[PDB]
Symmetry: D2
Subunit: 174 residues, 4 copies
């Protein structure tokens, strides 16, 4: 009931649009986090550690869209800075668990003190759509596919990010 | 008139959603193109060469969301396969121009003969939204930001991709 | 799992938005059809008769969002003009069926010769959203609810309207 | 730059969709308000009176999508019930102003005690889209046209309706 043509059209559409979105976010994300000598995957774990305090590196991998192997290496380089701590559970656990540090939290805070959304590209690009809608675009069409792929357990990172950001101290002036 | 809080919420929203979209497309794109020993940026140039027959590597970079330096190296490794050809313009041109080859076109065709949209993730993930809308999601909210960033000249790749795909031979059976 | 508050908010939202949409379409629809001394429900039947050539007044009621009683009276006043014809089926049929006339078709055509979308309000109001999307808004969110209510058989009027309009003679110049 | 064909397609699309939306809301709105012997335009004024305490009948007409003449007659039949009160301003005012009564407020409250969103059609029809989006559809595409027509001053009724509904007593149990 579905044409291969309309499929290829869809795929070429979203593949070009997704690469434009990640590559532009990469540039603004890296410039924001490079003054602390970190990469986007390491920072992802540092924010995942704030939003979920104690999580297996396997969960860090799922929420981080990383390989388990990849998340291990960056988490270990993060402990070796003191920005993160490691824990092992009782009984019999193969899993290795992860928490943040006061040095790690403070690094996130001084990054928050330097958050200029003006410099970020997608922010300015979404200012037109915000003025017509009254609020930032909620891109529900995209959000539906991602849940329908990664799972509802993956999507819960948005909820906990929002609620923790809602109860947040000293973002900037005021 | 805009809260820094609603900005951070937006940024964390789209940054998590964009990374999920590119990483899942990467895996399905690479598996599709790896039987020919190519990467996603090289294939991008091979499709850009079909949709725009003669283009500067600088335009290949803009449409490809690549650095000019990066597009040069992959285009040169593509000529050294015979999948692509190079040209230089008259008068005085610093620019180096690019065309496809019959070997390069045929490689795209045998990849088209192996296009199973079932294996691609975002395809199956968009089947729910297609049934409710009658047709594949057009994600216009995203498409507006990207144009408002990369430029209308960048966006013309979708038009020429659609029209060339509409006039396409032997995708699969029928 | 659902708040009565978010329900009331939704209802007050769509009830105010729907009344604004119908009342503004009423004014532009009536001004367009009043030079022929017809109402919006009568014209609806005249277009339903073009898109579905022979239909029961009960189907005219479903597609017309009219009562069966209401559709009868207007269809009868339409036959008594010669803009429409009536038929009765074989065997044993309670139903009364309906077709268009050459006088009725020509009335639709001279209305088509007078279609100025500039005067229609929603047209100009949708010009902003069309420029950002490249094409007229497809309001899929609304279209999903209506199908989920009236039925898929009701929705088929859009398909046959589009395809018949695609194969249409002398709309205006060219 | 715009086809008359794509215009007619758009108009037939939204005209059929808007009539389906108003007619279905009419039936559920009237059944909800008929036990108090009121019509949808009268109830509209009674809610406009709650959301804007003292407003000219001309503003009631704009927010109510009514004629000034029509809003006068229903407001006068509302005062003659004691559900509403009238006032005249100082200096020199042609305008006649309007406020609610305790009898009028209590009528709205006992209607709120009888609000079953299950019986309302569009509510159940929007339950599918809510489950995929996590929240009720916000139909921003429609909301943009209406603002681009009726004006931003008209749209402020949604803001004051939301904020007043957010600070509301005894909707139902809890």
């Amino acid at each position: 009931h579905y044409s291969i043509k309309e499929a290829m059209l869809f795929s070429q559409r979203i593949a070009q649009l997704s690469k434009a979105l990640w590559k532009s976010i990469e540039k603004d994300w890296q410039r924001w986090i490079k003054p602390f000598d970190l990469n986007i995957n390491e920072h992802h774990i540092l924010w995942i550690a704030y939003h979920f305090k104690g999580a297996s590196i396997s969960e860090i991998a799922k929420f981080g869209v990383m390989h388990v192997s990849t998340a291990f290496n960056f988490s270990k380089k993060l402990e070796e800075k003191g920005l993160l701590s490691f824990s092992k559970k009782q009984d019999d656990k193969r899993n290795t668990y992860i928490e943040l540090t006061e040095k790690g939290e403070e690094v996130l805070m001084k990054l928050m003190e330097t958050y200029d959304p003006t410099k970020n590209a997608v922010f300015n690009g979404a200012l037109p759509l915000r003025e017509l809608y009254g609020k930032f675009p909620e891109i529900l069409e995209m959000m539906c596919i991602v849940r329908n792929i990664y799972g509802d357990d993956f999507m819960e990172i948005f909820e906990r990010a929002f609620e923790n950001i809602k109860e947040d101290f000293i973002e900037q002036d005021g």
